[model samples]
Target: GEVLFAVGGWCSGDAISSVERYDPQTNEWRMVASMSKRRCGVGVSVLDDLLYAVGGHDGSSYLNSVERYDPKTNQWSSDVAPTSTCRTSVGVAVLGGFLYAVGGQDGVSCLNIVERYDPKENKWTRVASMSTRRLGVAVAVLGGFLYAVGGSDGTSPLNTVERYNPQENRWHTIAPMGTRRKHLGCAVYQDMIYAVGGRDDTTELSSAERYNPRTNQWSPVVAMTSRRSGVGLAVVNGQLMAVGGFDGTTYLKTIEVFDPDANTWRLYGGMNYRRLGGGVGVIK
Candidate 1:
């Protein structure tokens, strides 16, 4: 499927449902569709060729709400939420036909809660929690395991990393990151995990690194164009695309893409507006 970025933050922008689609074939970006529920800190995932926006915060109350979008039909349908936590900044991914929601804030505190949604059953079930409580973490599927990367635990950013084994039904610690980060744009490419810019407190970071599961080590990658946190990473056309994010000074609308072969970042096409805490997903 094509790469699409959906939804806007709940607290900040007037254009809440702002969504954009990037066409690699045409090398152009256009404002295509919008979310029905305008919220931020939400996670985006794709299952069964449909895009999903998971838990989020609507400024005041935390939400366990979810919304589904059909790219072919350009339709939106709200779905039942899976957790009582009503979290935001959770790590979300699709595995084995299930949508997994990892740690995020519950408004009052960071969480280690884990939930899985079955589209066939139309249900959400509590699953094994991660070892560390975190928010704004990044998750990717690698080698039949679900990897949960660094995020904050409330007071400080985290350098911890863990992996969940579906057969074992438990999480195990993996190699730590080079830096503590939360709100990073992370994606998997060439059987490795890449963690991009994130913040550790008020200080924004420009560092980028990738993890090799075979060696259980993280090595520094070529840095991004600027310091960013809350950027969403999507793999489209074999390049890692970094979507719009806050770059410390202001909310940004610029786009950057990394070519692993060249080990460099170049300006990708961008959209009309910046999307803070929204979801980015690719339909392939």
Candidate 2:
């Protein structure tokens, strides 16, 4: 029952509450539980067998609301805790049994503050903030560290990257990405962190990059077939998948899979609904 969840996103009209779960074995997407509020640029992370949908904006306003989905019940609960701040383009990840809500914007400005939520206590608390204010940041945990990837600082797209150590409670600068990007998709695959398609200030990006934590460096990878920003990424069966996003001219439904071994990208499949600024997570 290893499946990937694509949370709420924006299409043509407004923010969406729809959630689509992809079965890798079947190569299909089935509509599942929907959130109470429409959320575009949502942040999703799996913790303790439940999937949490964090802050993003509804059509009307930015949202501080958070919801959880229990696959067994196939229902979403808004009864959980809301974040301290309403945000969009945020990064969410689980580390050391705690959920970390990373950088995003609060409608007015990009945010550098971070928050950690504990399910056991149902409490939200502040943590060390990132050095750079970032919106559209991507957070992933690897080797007991949380890495916040490139995003925009309201002024321009960023190439800076930072790593958070829970034990130290500190965020330190790491190797920057080769390309400045915001709304990028980041995932860990076979020990390497892959930064997928997103836009810079000028245009949407088709290029992908891989970072080796051991080497503290990033190298270019094969570009996607189409330029995409606000994309959702996940790794299924050792292959990295990029989901729906806007391609400058059109909001996309197309999906692409990159095979690290062969260093190539191929068409995976398409989603039922067009999605942009969506969040993706794997239920393994």
Candidate 3:
């Protein structure tokens, strides 16, 4: 079975550099190697055997820096090149052997600019920008295409959705979500792109939905037990795992795993620390 890693995020006082690992077999979480800097709103993804942590804030400033963790060494290294633009709450996903960094806040405003990192080239290059600026965007790859889900346009939460075709080098609008969201958790499970909880204009959300790339439609799913903004979502052992997040009033250490067969979510063991806006990765 593969393990899930929850990276740096914020709690009450400030951003944190802590890292925690969850073993599915044991159903428990253990503290792991911390990042070089505290990162909130980080974008995390696994490429090959290495896990990459892209731009986010380190409390003082939004980061353009990138970091990688090698499990064999049990360490995080900061040798990777930074993104072209500083991004916090950036959407990140891997497609066609490259790591794509999508829309996020660049301090001055929400950004529409996008970039992709080529490991072979060891560099980050600009890609086609999204038509709509988005911060706290949630990105995931499904059916060989990258999907950018709902997020704020810096003014208000957006329900508009878009999908990128790497072969065409362009992004086209897709079906809009039923609800507006930002800082949401997104992951692909069983060919479906699950859009989990996030914050909207009036309050945090507990609602969850899924989009079918095949039919080009969005449908509702069972809501989570708690409202979660800045939540981390991943697939572990064929189950969708929702990790720690901010639940409107407080940061959370709780976790939930979805049973697709049962069409329900069950509570799982909590993490050692409460986290929100963290990055999540699965290592086999």
What is the C-alpha local distance difference test score of each model?
Answer: 0.79, 0.85, 0.83
Comparing 1 and 2 on TM-score, the stronger one: 2
Model 1, range 1-284, lDDT digits (tens) per residue?
A: 36655455324554255666677667666666566776766777888888887888766767887888888878778765546568887888988888899999986789998898888888888899999998888899888889999988887889999999988999999999989887787899878999988887668887799999889999999988878777778788777777777788887667788876787888654655545335678885
TM-score of each: 0.91, 0.93, 0.94
Residue 12, model 2: Cα distance from true site in angstroms: 7.1
Local error of candidate 1 at 82, Å?
4.4
lDDT of 3 at 200: 82
Q: Worst ten-residue run, lDDT, model 3?
A: 9-18
Tell me the alpha-carbon RMSD of every candidate.
2.2, 1.8, 1.8
| Model 3 spans with C-alpha error above 4 angstroms | 11-15
Looking at model 1, residue 67 earns an lDDT score of 86
| Candidate 1 Cα deviation (angstroms), residue 174 | 0.8
Model 2 TM-score is 0.93
Best by lDDT: 2
